[PDB]
């Protein structure tokens, strides 16, 4: 249960990143649509930098540095 829930959450989050990126980066110097950067296209875990970003910066504190120094 926790696994399915988690992975749905992260996929949702990454797609939201994709649409925001799509809105902001419309302009001439096109990198085109959101792409992997690897030469081989297959699933690779998110960086946790990719997921949490542009996020208001409050929950990157507790998510990235949160676990260390406990609650």
């Amino acid at each position: 249960l926790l696994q399915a829930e988690k992975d749905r959450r992260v996929l949702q989050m990454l797609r939201e990143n994709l649409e925001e990126e799509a809105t902001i980066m419309k302009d001439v110097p096109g990198w085109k649509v959101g792409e992997s950067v690897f030469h081989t296209t297959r699933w690779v875990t998110p960086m946790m930098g990719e997921l949490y970003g542009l996020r208001t910066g409050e929950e990157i504190l507790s998510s990235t540095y949160g676990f260390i120094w406990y609650t």
Binding site: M47, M48, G49, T64, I68
Partner: protein, 175 residues
């Protein structure tokens, strides 16, 4: 809500050595190190290095620096213990490493690096852990693997230590 604290601790850590390495006497040497090392606990811990950080907080801080300051205190006796000299190039390298360190934290836009050493890359964001593993340190279990898998490795270490004993006393002239 700064959360650059890994980088602040990195910077103060550098500062310890920068302003540290000069001046003639070790008596402040101990201070400079122990400061920088405790900050090292800062770094390692802030990556979640908890045990390892505590080991540089036990062996190196306590064992090393205590034994150093013990010998220094025993070997040299300081009547004056003044402000001495030689710190000029240390502060001037705190300025050259202040606009050089501020050059690597300035040019950090996109990727920053140097033309002397290997490449670097830079920018303001930081990569870390996810993918929780239930009831694992990811570290201390590693050292449990030291005792399980580290057969040859603990052999060479321990042997090199016992040789440590016979060498040290042998040089202090038991005869």
């Amino acid at each position: 809500m700064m959360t650059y604290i890994v980088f602040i601790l990195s910077i103060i850590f550098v500062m310890g050595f920068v302003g540290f390495s000069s001046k003639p006497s070790p008596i402040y040497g101990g201070l400079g190190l122990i400061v920088s090392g405790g900050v090292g606990c800062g770094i390692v811990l802030n990556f979640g290095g908890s045990f390892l950080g505590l080991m540089v907080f036990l062996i190196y801080l306590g064992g090393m620096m205590v034994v150093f300051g013990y010998t220094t205190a025993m070997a040299t006796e300081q009547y004056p213990e003044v402000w001495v000299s030689n710190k000029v190039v240390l502060g001037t390298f705190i300025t050259g490493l202040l606009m050089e360190f501020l050059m690597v934290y300035y040019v950090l836009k996109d990727k920053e690096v140097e033309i002397v050493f290997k490449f670097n890359g830079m920018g303001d964001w930081v990569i870390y852990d996810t993918g929780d593993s239930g009831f694992f340190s990811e570290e201390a279990m590693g050292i449990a693997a030291l005792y399980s898998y580290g057969t040859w490795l603990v052999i060479v270490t321990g042997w090199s230590l016992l040789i440590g004993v016979v060498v040290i006393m042998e040089i202090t002239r038991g005869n």
